[PDB]
Design an enzyme around this catalytic site. Structure first.
Site, PDB file in Angstrom:
ATOM      1  N   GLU A 108      46.792  31.958  36.229  1.00 17.99           N
ATOM      2  CA  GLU A 108      48.069  32.503  35.731  1.00 17.99           C
ATOM      3  C   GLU A 108      49.117  31.426  35.479  1.00 17.99           C
ATOM      4  O   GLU A 108      50.125  31.693  34.806  1.00 17.99           O
ATOM      5  CB  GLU A 108      48.662  33.531  36.699  1.00 17.99           C
ATOM      6  CG  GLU A 108      47.732  34.666  37.095  1.00 17.99           C
ATOM      7  CD  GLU A 108      47.007  34.413  38.409  1.00 17.99           C
ATOM      8  OE1 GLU A 108      46.551  33.271  38.658  1.00 17.99           O
ATOM      9  OE2 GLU A 108      46.884  35.375  39.194  1.00 17.99           O
TER      10      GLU A 108
HETATM   11  C1  HEM Z   1      49.844  26.864  43.881  1.00 14.92           C
HETATM   12  C2  HEM Z   1      50.709  27.935  43.951  1.00 14.92           C
HETATM   13  C3  HEM Z   1      50.170  29.164  44.701  1.00 14.92           C
HETATM   14  C4  HEM Z   1      49.757  29.254  45.961  1.00 14.92           C
HETATM   15  C5  HEM Z   1      49.737  28.150  47.035  1.00 14.92           C
HETATM   16  C6  HEM Z   1      49.309  30.616  46.173  1.00 14.92           C
HETATM   17  C7  HEM Z   1      48.829  31.145  47.359  1.00 14.92           C
HETATM   18  C8  HEM Z   1      48.068  32.282  47.469  1.00 14.92           C
HETATM   19  C9  HEM Z   1      47.429  32.796  48.676  1.00 14.92           C
HETATM   20  C10 HEM Z   1      47.530  32.160  50.093  1.00 14.92           C
HETATM   21  C11 HEM Z   1      46.730  33.899  48.329  1.00 14.92           C
HETATM   22  C12 HEM Z   1      45.837  34.792  49.237  1.00 14.92           C
HETATM   23  C13 HEM Z   1      46.532  35.313  50.493  1.00 14.92           C
HETATM   24  C14 HEM Z   1      45.516  35.690  51.550  1.00 14.92           C
HETATM   25  O1  HEM Z   1      44.354  35.182  51.571  1.00 14.92           O
HETATM   26  O2  HEM Z   1      45.893  36.500  52.427  1.00 14.92           O
HETATM   27  C15 HEM Z   1      46.913  34.106  46.890  1.00 14.92           C
HETATM   28  C16 HEM Z   1      46.377  35.082  46.062  1.00 14.92           C
HETATM   29  C17 HEM Z   1      46.972  35.544  44.916  1.00 14.92           C
HETATM   30  N1  HEM Z   1      48.059  34.962  44.256  1.00 14.92           N
HETATM   31 FE1  HEM Z   1      48.741  33.127  44.628  1.00 14.92          FE
HETATM   32  N2  HEM Z   1      49.470  31.308  44.979  1.00 14.92           N
HETATM   33  C18 HEM Z   1      50.014  30.438  44.064  1.00 14.92           C
HETATM   34  C19 HEM Z   1      50.388  30.769  42.793  1.00 14.92           C
HETATM   35  C20 HEM Z   1      50.416  32.051  42.322  1.00 14.92           C
HETATM   36  C21 HEM Z   1      51.149  32.529  41.186  1.00 14.92           C
HETATM   37  C22 HEM Z   1      52.048  31.641  40.317  1.00 14.92           C
HETATM   38  C23 HEM Z   1      50.894  33.834  41.042  1.00 14.92           C
HETATM   39  C24 HEM Z   1      51.438  34.847  40.019  1.00 14.92           C
HETATM   40  C25 HEM Z   1      51.440  34.580  38.677  1.00 14.92           C
HETATM   41  C26 HEM Z   1      49.996  34.212  42.108  1.00 14.92           C
HETATM   42  C27 HEM Z   1      49.470  35.451  42.305  1.00 14.92           C
HETATM   43  C28 HEM Z   1      48.450  35.724  43.174  1.00 14.92           C
HETATM   44  C29 HEM Z   1      47.598  36.886  43.092  1.00 14.92           C
HETATM   45  C30 HEM Z   1      47.679  38.021  42.075  1.00 14.92           C
HETATM   46  C31 HEM Z   1      46.635  36.760  44.230  1.00 14.92           C
HETATM   47  C32 HEM Z   1      45.499  37.738  44.522  1.00 14.92           C
HETATM   48  C33 HEM Z   1      44.253  37.164  43.805  1.00 14.92           C
HETATM   49  C34 HEM Z   1      43.007  37.973  44.063  1.00 14.92           C
HETATM   50  O3  HEM Z   1      42.566  38.021  45.229  1.00 14.92           O
HETATM   51  O4  HEM Z   1      42.420  38.535  43.079  1.00 14.92           O
HETATM   52  N3  HEM Z   1      49.720  33.104  42.867  1.00 14.92           N
HETATM   53  N4  HEM Z   1      47.720  33.097  46.396  1.00 14.92           N
END
Ligand code: HEM
Ligand code: HEM
Ligand code: HEM
Ligand code: HEM
Ligand SMILES: O=C([O-])C(=O)[O-]
Ligand SMILES: O=C([O-])C(=O)[O-]
Ligand SMILES: O=C([O-])C(=O)[O-]
Ligand SMILES: O=C([O-])C(=O)[O-]
Ligand SMILES: [Ca+2]
Ligand SMILES: [Ca+2]
Lengths: 306, 312
Positions: A108
């Site tokens: 994304e």
């Molecule tokens: C490098 C920057 C980012 C970091 C460090 C990060 C961190 C994370 C973490 C820790 C999780 C999973 C949480 C868990 O395991 O309980 C996750 C999943 C997710 N994040 Fe991020 N995120 C980042 C950027 C983004 C951005 C910019 C977006 C929105 C456009 C986003 C949207 C999502 C979504 C929708 C999930 C669920 C994915 C799935 O399991 O299908 N993330 N992220």
């Protein structure tokens, strides 16, 4: 009975610790945490230079984005609800869902790992910080080290001292009457089977997902060899909307959906309300984060791509 | 050396160490905190994705790293986002406009309808739907029956913005008496800045931000054009922190600070700059980067069932 309930809960859950947990093969230091924080808020990790980790996992908004599913590059709506960063360090189920046998830079954000590394290398202050945070490495500016730095910062984004944690630690009256009734139901109805332990979920995959058919319902996906994470319910009251698709905005409604015949569970309206009240007790102390001052780009830094 | 420091000390003032007092808008702790919450709350936008900080990012020199800002719907806007840093000291609220329009302007609240896609009423509705905001407004604006208004919202944001100032730049320390706060090249640059007449438009406390002039940068690919015949004017921006608020000019068309300086060495002003002189002035402009604000990220209150849903 009140004593019995508390003891029962103390054998099924654990409180959030006061300090960031130690990460497998990724040790914390003050400079690494600071680097990880800068990276977490730096939109130059995205192609557009508009989107950072905080955009979708907003530390001031319960660690999420207030959206059904996240919006990313180009105003593209994504397939999934952004899970909270809060207490994410304690989870072991990395993805919302996928094939049970099948189960990287964010798509994304629209940047490849090499593009991100190019961007970091173009800014001397980041290069210098990487040398301090990952010392004794010829070239510490790697995508994996970037991820490690972010992860040590994320390890600090935990929320101790919720009312339920104070209850677990001994204070029966940390929960009011309704919340206490809700806890009893949460255990008796079997919610704790999938939403238990330290994070009240976040550790198991189950062949059940919420779909539109009381407008939404749990469906059984085992025939499809497909599974969904049972999420951690910590801070659930402030991480609306709910489920993988963000389709339900009311916590009481989300509880009612989870009162599913798929689990052999039935919930009256009053029971769902009591459980939702209990889930409110899981909101912890929100993290205190000093906004990072991120270093200037240089002429070598890639331009935004919109 | 001593004559140069003395004339500088008359033409410029350093950024104050304390947030300036705002007339009719007393800073209190709770008002500053409220202002901060609002500044970072993307629910001020229709989409619930864009906050003031999105485009005026406190950790990125108070800007957005873009040629022109991208707002609601991924829509590229017409103008470069000016820095929030030290914006409190400016009087010229717009990049550009018709001379007859910008003459006799009075200071008004921020309205970002195109950028954020919300109306003032939609904002007030959103704030009124969250008890904690209602309660904070009552604390910050005591004695007012209904303190949740667009003006009070803007006032709270403004008191917070008043704290987003950047004292103790090397130039400011030089103004305060330390000659060696500037190195040789920066010192050479300062003399050029004064001698070439830059200070005429980029002077005073904020080195600009107070005057509109009939000159704008248009497509050495870019140059100053005289717009008096068109009865049109442009803000001469505050040059504080200019080294970290790239790209430059109203359209964000020039990324190099040295090149921006070279463009400003315009015959339209009777100014000529050698390449070495532009490099020297750019070095001086780098001395205007002050201490960046240390802001604790606000913990913003949960929406309720009454809160409008995101409108993407
Ligand atoms: C490098 C920057 C980012 C970091 C460090 C990060 C961190 C994370 C973490 C820790 C999780 C999973 C949480 C868990 O395991 O309980 C996750 C999943 C997710 N994040 Fe991020 N995120 C980042 C950027 C983004 C951005 C910019 C977006 C929105 C456009 C986003 C949207 C999502 C979504 C929708 C999930 C669920 C994915 C799935 O399991 O299908 N993330 N992220
Ligand atoms: C009445 C008892 C239960 C309650 C109150 C409950 C509560 C919840 C809540 C509030 C959510 C949404 C979390 C979020 O979006 O962050 C959720 C999701 C989920 N729960 Fe439960 N749960 C219960 C029983 C169960 C059981 C027994 C299982 C496992 C067999 C389970 C598995 C899941 C799964 C897989 C999801 C994600 C579904 C999706 O996103 O489509 N739940 N639960
Ligand atoms: C309510 C939140 C916002 C606040 C408080 C705010 C504050 C300001 C201030 C103070 C100025 C003029 C600077 C000066 O007087 O020295 C300005 C101008 C500007 N801001 Fe914002 N802003 C906000 C939202 C946004 C957003 C979300 C964007 C990007 C999509 C944006 C982009 C711009 C642009 C392009 C200008 C120049 C407008 C022109 O002169 O044509 N602003 N803003
Ligand atoms: C060599 C002497 C000068 C230097 C080094 C200089 C420096 C600069 C810089 C760095 C900018 C870009 C600021 C930003 O984008 O934030 C700028 C813009 C501007 N300056 Fe100057 N300046 C000089 C002379 C002048 C004079 C004499 C005037 C007034 C007659 C003036 C009026 C303006 C205006 C109107 C803009 C905005 C133009 C646009 O955005 O299209 N400058 N100047
Ligand atoms: O900043 C934006 O425009 C966004 O979050 O998509
Ligand atoms: O905002 C909401 O819809 C909520 O809190 O359930
Ligand atoms: O990033 C740039 O292009 C700069 O600093 O001039
Ligand atoms: O929040 C604002 O100030 C707006 O949307 O105009
Ligand atoms: Ca959610
Ligand atoms: Ca700029």
């Amino acid at each position: 009975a009140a004593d019995e309930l508390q003891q029962r809960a103390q054998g099924l859950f654990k409180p959030v610790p006061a300090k960031a947990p130690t990460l497998k093969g990724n040790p914390a230091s003050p400079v690494k945490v600071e680097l990880g924080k800068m990276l977490y808020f730096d939109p130059r990790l995205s192609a557009s230079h508009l989107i950072s980790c905080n955009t979708c996992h907003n530390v001031g908004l319960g660690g999420g984005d207030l959206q059904a599913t996240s919006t990313g590059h180009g105003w593209q709506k994504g397939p999934r609800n952004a899970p909270t960063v809060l207490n994410s360090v304690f989870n072991t189920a990395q993805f919302w869902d996928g094939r049970a046998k099948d189960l990287q830079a964010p798509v994304e954000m629209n940047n490849t790992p090499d593009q991100v590394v190019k961007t970091l290398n173009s800014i001397p202050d980041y290069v210098a910080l990487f040398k301090k945070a990952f010392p004794g490495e010829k070239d510490p500016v790697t995508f994996d080290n970037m991820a490690k730095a972010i992860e040590v910062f994320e390890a600090t984004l935990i929320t101790p001292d919720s009312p339920f944690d104070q209850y677990l630690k001994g204070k029966k009256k940390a929960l009011d009457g309704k919340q206490t009734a809700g806890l009893k139901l949460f255990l008796d109805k079997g919610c704790v089977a999938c939403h238990g332990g330290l994070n009240l979920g976040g550790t198991g995959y189950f062949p059940f997902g919420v779909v539109e058919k009381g407008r939404f319902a749990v469906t059984n996906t085992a025939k499809d060899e497909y599974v969904f994470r049972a999420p951690s319910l910590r801070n659930v009251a402030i991480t609306y909307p709910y489920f993988h698709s963000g389709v339900v905005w009311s916590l009481k409604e989300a509880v009612a959906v989870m009162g599913s015949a798929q689990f052999g569970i039935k919930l009256s309206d009053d029971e769902s309300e009591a459980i939702a009240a209990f889930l409110g007790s899981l909101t912890g102390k929100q993290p205190k984060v000093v906004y990072p001052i991120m270093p200037a780009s240089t002429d070598a830094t890639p331009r935004p791509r919109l």
